[PDB]
């Protein structure tokens, strides 16, 4: 999150997280992010779920294009730069930078 | 014949719609689970 350098939207950077413990309460209760959309699981009660792996795909866009990042949507960025699975189980976080 | 990609070119005076936004998508993969949650505690009484 606090990483200084982010790649382009078409060059979205992917990281793998495993063998650790994740506290999503701090992220959810931060107020510094204007985008908190969790699909598949509730935004809260994430502390009761344990998974094998976590994939973090980070990039930067302009505000007008923050809408297209969601299942079942269409748009320039989604279709040509970063397309996501329709039935993914995860959460998208974003904030003005 | 046109170059496929274009530059946003962000400026300090950007509008709310055109202002830059950082986006991170966290996808959880499960198929032995390795990353678990925090499960709080209390005090002991005897």
């Amino acid at each position, epitope marked *: 999150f606090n990483a200084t350098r982010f790649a382009s939207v078409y060059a979205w950077n992917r990281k793998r997280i495993s063998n650790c413990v994740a506290d999503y309460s701090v992220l959810y*209760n931060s*107020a510094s992010f*204007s985008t908190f959309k969790c699909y598949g699981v509730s935004p809260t009660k994430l502390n009761d779920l344990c998974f094998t792996n976590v994939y973090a795909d980070s990039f930067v866009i302009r*505000g*007008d294009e*923050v*809408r297209q990042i969601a299942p079942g949507q269409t748009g320039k960025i989604a279709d040509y730069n970063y397309k996501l699975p329709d039935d993914f189980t995860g959460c998208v976080i974003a*904030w*003005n*930078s | 014949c046109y170059f496929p990609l274009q530059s946003y070119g962000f400026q300090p005076t950007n509008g*709310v*719609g055109y*202002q830059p936004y950082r986006v991170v998508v966290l996808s959880f993969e499960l198929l032995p689970a390795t990353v678990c949650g925090p499960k709080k505690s209390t005090n002991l009484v005897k």
Partner: nanobody
Amino acid sequence: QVQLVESGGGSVQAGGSLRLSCAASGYTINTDAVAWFRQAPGKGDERVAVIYTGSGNTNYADSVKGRFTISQDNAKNTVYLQMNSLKPEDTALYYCASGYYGASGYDFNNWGQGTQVTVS
């Protein structure tokens, strides 16, 4: 054809209250949704609250929930933001935006000079 003017800002102590006004002029019938957003110097835009004029549904930023209340007066053609239990984080310029539809943050426009609120 639509104008929004913000007023009611000022300097208050922590825990104080202010009541900010968004007076609309022109043919505002098309704009069903009205939102209040704020910007501090260093930081970017954020929407504190939004309201649907026809339905009455409202949305609030997690930080402001409980302390802020959004209301409208049709006769005044004004949307009001009530700030209670003001906090230093609340300090920034406040403006009201308006749009036909609520899917996106841009369709809101027509926001005025804004009002400064400082909590110290």
